[PDB]
Design a protein around this nucleic acid. Sequence first.
RNA 1: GAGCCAGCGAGUACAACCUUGGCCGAGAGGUCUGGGUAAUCUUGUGAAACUCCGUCGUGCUGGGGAUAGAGCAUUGUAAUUAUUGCUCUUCAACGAGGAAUUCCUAGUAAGCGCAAGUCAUCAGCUUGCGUUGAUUACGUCCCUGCCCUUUGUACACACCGC
Lengths: 112, 53, 143, 96, 106, 70, 123, 145
Amino acid sequence: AIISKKRKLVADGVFYAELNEFFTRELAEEGYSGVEVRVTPTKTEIIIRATKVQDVVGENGRRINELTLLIEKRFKYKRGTIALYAERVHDRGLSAVAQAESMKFKLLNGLA
Amino acid sequence: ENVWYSHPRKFGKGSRQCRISGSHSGLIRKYGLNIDRQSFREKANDIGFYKYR
Amino acid sequence: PGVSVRDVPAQDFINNYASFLQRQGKLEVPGYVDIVKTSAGNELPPQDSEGWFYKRAASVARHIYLRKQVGVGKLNKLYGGAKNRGVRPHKHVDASGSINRKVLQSLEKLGVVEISPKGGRRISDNGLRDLDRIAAATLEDEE
Amino acid sequence: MLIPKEDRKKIYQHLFQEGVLVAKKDFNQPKHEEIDTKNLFVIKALQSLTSKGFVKTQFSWQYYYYTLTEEGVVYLREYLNLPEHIFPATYLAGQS
Amino acid sequence: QEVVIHKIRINLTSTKVKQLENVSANIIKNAETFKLVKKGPVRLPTKVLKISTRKTPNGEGSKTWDTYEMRIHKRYIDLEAPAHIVKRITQITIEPGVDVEVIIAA
Amino acid sequence: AKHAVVLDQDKFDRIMKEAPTYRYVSVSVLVDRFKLGGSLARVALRHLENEGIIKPVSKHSKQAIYTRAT
Amino acid sequence: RKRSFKTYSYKGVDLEKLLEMPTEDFVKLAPARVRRKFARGLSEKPAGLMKKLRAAKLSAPENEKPAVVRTHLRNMIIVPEMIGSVVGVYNGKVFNQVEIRPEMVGHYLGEFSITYTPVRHGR
Amino acid sequence: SLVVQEQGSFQHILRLLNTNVDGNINVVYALTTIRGVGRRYANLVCKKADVDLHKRAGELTQEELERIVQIMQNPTHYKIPAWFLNRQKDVNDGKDYHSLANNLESKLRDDLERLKKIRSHRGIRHFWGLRVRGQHTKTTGRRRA
RNA sequence: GAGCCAGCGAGUACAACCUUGGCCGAGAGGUCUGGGUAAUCUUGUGAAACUCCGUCGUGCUGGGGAUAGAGCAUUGUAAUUAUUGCUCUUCAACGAGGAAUUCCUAGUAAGCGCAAGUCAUCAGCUUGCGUUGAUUACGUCCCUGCCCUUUGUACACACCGC
Ligand SMILES: [Mg+2]
Ligand SMILES: [Mg+2]
Ligand SMILES: [Mg+2]
Ligand SMILES: [Mg+2]
């Protein structure tokens, strides 16, 4: 902690990007679209927009918990200071990333 | 397990890898990015960097 | 009316100061006189050779008077210029630092320059008076 | 692969404690974060585990990520001894 | 009983500008409500982070460039106000995007 | 070398004879009327400006324009 | 006769002192680069090779050359301890035999080998 | 400052250190013209002598010339720092020295010979008739000695 | 010698960043000390080209600075196949460049330096920046390219065609 403000910002951005990439990689089955990061004091809110919200969740805190743990491991945080949430997307068709993902899935399956 | 498996790679092209590819080619080390330029370009918008002028 | 240091056209003032110094014969010699370049880029020592040093000192004093608080590196920067570095283009490299320091020391000894807080040096009262006198003289000459 | 078995055991224990593992993609690194073993060794172990099912691996951004499946968890338990109603991150510790 | 004014600077750094402005406004409103002596929202020079990059990966074709840039917006709100009040302020008025931060020590 | 650098009493005398005449005296003008070379010419000019004879117009380094009294 | 042609040497005096002055002295009486090198951390440079050289010197036939000591460390400087012994300076191919003399003193081992084969056609 | 009055004409071209000191011009310039003295060094010498740099100085005095010669000969005896020189630090354990004429040339030759004997990379390059100080002759300088 | 004015920037705490200010050193560069995570300190980055007074005057000259030799420095584990800097010395070609051909229309051209980028160390490079700041058009299809239209076509992998 304690760096040049600009530098800090850049770092944060990089972290966000990394997170996004991870989500893209990992939550393919779940149909992930995008992340929303809110860095308040103490807690940090990581909101996730995916299609299969239930899938993302697991069975009342499992997959999400694991993800959180992984994040903590990556970025030297403690338990409590990261808070994941898996939310629905308001209109999937308006989103582009989601659509792309769907298309990819279809291709994988083997469709015209 | 072997003793000598390390030249001193403190500094230079060899030490400074990127975050994504782990390359030593076109490495943006400005503002502590540490990103091969192509990679940065691919993600720049997500990392807050936008084209204006 | 009111006599001031600025009314004199610079170069003239400097010359006057140099003359005064010469008359005094008590600015004190460094030891490197004409076995010295004056800047790291100057393929020829001072053409005046004997003297010159006094003039430089005067200039330094004037600069100090002008500014709030000045040091050695800054002075060097002010002084230095372009190296005819070769077939390569010109950089800016700073002037003779040691020489500058010596000059400063001499000034201090005289009672021109005074040590300031924060950093560097400012001006003494006697020095100021001397400067004023010089300015007056210059004005008279002009008249 | 050539592991002093104690180290391996330690690694396994750590994994169990976690319910997860995050490694670098950095060979030549003398010792891992948290565990007092070589990172390379840990990575190798993880790879081995993956090869016999158990672990799920992601290689993103010079960071290997690892999570245990039910079968994997069971295997780990067997390796250890610990019977039932235990740590990992399959369920919460209390309220968090 | 206390009324111990430590003299507290709130920094407000961000990329998104409108949001930052809104936050500042909110802060000002809060201050007004609490009725304190404060210097108004001082705005510092917008530091721009420039990354010039050859558009190409392979450096083949014409030599075209892309100046990608980041705008940093940095504001200061200097409160001549107590500790408790400062704490309260910190507690209420937090938005996403803006980096709320307190110096506290004059 | 093209000569006109050698210094003499006779030469000096001829130079003197005379400051009077010529609309303007410029180092350049002096050389080459085939007189003493550059520096020498400058020196001569300076001398001429001691006590009247040739008064100045400009005063710059190398662009030193002087003219006859009075 | 008295003085043999002229002294083969570094900065002043004669040979008799060169051979018996060890390393520090040499450094003191050497160029700037050499001094700098000496100042920096010496580990593996003057250690094994030197020993080998010494051994060679010990176990020579007397009058004839010592054994050829092969060398990668072409970065090393010719100090006076091993004047006379033959060193095989490495050039990727070949440990090129370099004979150390009273004049080769205070120069690099690598600058007596030449890695490339020099240009032909027209000099 | 002053035009040379009086008869003048005191020797066009003087001979000094087995080389041609040119008449008129200036002492420094003359020194430079000698095979081995340069500009700054020449200036220094002049300063030591105590002659004006403004004077053309082919009408120099004999004593002055002698003094100059002496200066050229000896670095250490006079006030010359002894790291301002052409050569410095040479033979086994000893002193810094330099020449300035024919002498200088001889010294240079000797140095070259020594280099050749050593068979150092530089020496080798010299022998070849090539580029000692590692400048790239892939494009540049296509004629050579 | 003296005068002496910019704008883009960038810059470290797990490292070793920018580094003023003080002393040593002709320099380079050393040292002690700071200030700065930065409209705060470096930094008014008192950058150059410029302006003033003097020295050489149109001579391969004090223009020009190459190749050279030596030493002094620094970066790094390692500097010879000079990393770079500095100090002295050497003084080569070149008196505005043929056939050709590039760039340019206003704060432009050209000059001038700075600046970050790469970077342990190296700028003749580069992306920017400001400083100084013109000449000549403000047209045309002569050339060059490109575009259309009408024409002709044994071409359609399309003139490197058939
Ligand atoms: Mg020039
Ligand atoms: Mg500022
Ligand atoms: Mg010349
Ligand atoms: Mg380049």
